[PDB]
Structure 1
């Protein structure tokens, strides 16, 4: 039993809700919140900009030190950093950005990072400003993640479309 509330169950391990991931993280304080990161950990907009703003820019400060030490992530890769006031940990995961021409096949590799964590609060990878089809992202999530994932979808209209079209 966990503290996530109001989710629709899609499969044995995947759950979904129309919610603002920032507000959801502040309420649940999950062990792991997933950020929709880029390779530079520049949290300017989308989910990343919102999560970073909620940390009063502490996420960005920590991220800049991480990059200065380690260099950029790979597309499809991840790193574990602090969750600040939102979660114990933040798993920064880089899905391919279609608006940069990146290979959508890397979306499966991106979701594989979730399997290293027993329970996660997450957005749909490569959705929103990353330009992929969210219906496809949900399909890849369900077919790749085996651990327990609670998906927050900000847009109510999109949430209803994801549920109604789910196979």
Structure 2
């Protein structure tokens, strides 16, 4: 069945978290929407984007390249909706700020606001990893900003454990 999310920990009325690999979750769950941790040029060579793209056998990148060549880049804090290929009905490509590259952390709020157009989403923690932002902060912005139902996948067990502890303080 679609959107079969299993084994999540409910944080708030609409935010859930699991220590899991987002690619494997997308396969198990068959979600309507998977969120990609995109950059403005939809170049999915690394991070979560690379994992999602590889799981689509490069179909996501081919589609994204054609999109960008005609439609131009996204903005930091922005999004677009493309195909979910084999992983979901839709992929919501969301650009969080890359604070490793000096972008404004305040754009992380705008980034999460993109989730509010979709009733339920499977998602990574925005601006983590190669984007360099503090994950405890990202979870707080998620909780404070997203109103629709978001199921967060965090594969690194140590990070998952610190996030749950932070939420429960």
TM-score by length of 1: 0.98
Looking at structure 1, the residues matched to 128 and 155 of structure 2 have their Cα atoms a distance apart, in angstroms, of 11
Superposed displacement of residue 2, structure 1: 5.0
**Structure 1, residues 111-160: CA drift from partner, whole Å, max 9, x if none?**
00000000000001001110000000000000000000000001000000
Superposed displacement of residue 13, structure 1: 0.4
> Structure 2 vs 1, CA of residues 2 and 22 (structure 1 numbering), >3 Å: closer, same or farther?
closer
- How many residue pairs get matched? 167
* 1:110 aligned counterpart, secondary structure: helix
* Residue matched to 2:42: 41
> Structure 2 vs 1, CA of residues 3 and 43 (structure 1 numbering), >3 Å: closer, same or farther?
same
Do the aligned residues in 1 keep the contact of 2:3 with 2:30 (CA within 8 Å)?
A: no
Looking at structure 1, the residues matched to 27 and 130 of structure 2 have their Cα atoms a distance apart, in angstroms, of 23
Looking at structure 2, the residues matched to 2 and 87 of structure 1 have their Cα atoms a distance apart, in angstroms, of 9
**Structure 1, residues 79-101: CA drift from partner, whole Å, max 9, x if none?**
00000000000000000001111
Alignment of 1:63-78 (within 5 A): 63-78=64-79
Looking at structure 1, the residues matched to 3 and 87 of structure 2 have their Cα atoms a distance apart, in angstroms, of 17
Superposed displacement of residue 27, structure 1: 1.0
Structure 2 residue runs without a partner (length 5+): none
* 1:79 aligned counterpart, secondary structure: strand
Do the aligned residues in 1 keep the contact of 2:3 with 2:32 (CA within 8 Å)?
A: no
Do the aligned residues in 1 keep the contact of 2:3 with 2:29 (CA within 8 Å)?
A: no
Detail structure 1 runs of 4+ shifted over 2 Å in the superposition.
none
Structure 1 residue runs without a partner (length 5+): none
**Structure 1, residues 4-41: CA drift from partner, whole Å, max 9, x if none?**
00000000000000000000001111000000000000
> Structure 2 vs 1, CA of residues 2 and 28 (structure 1 numbering), >3 Å: closer, same or farther?
closer
Looking at structure 2, the residues matched to 70 and 28 of structure 1 have their Cα atoms a distance apart, in angstroms, of 31
**Structure 1, residues 39-76: CA drift from partner, whole Å, max 9, x if none?**
00000111000000000000000000110111100000
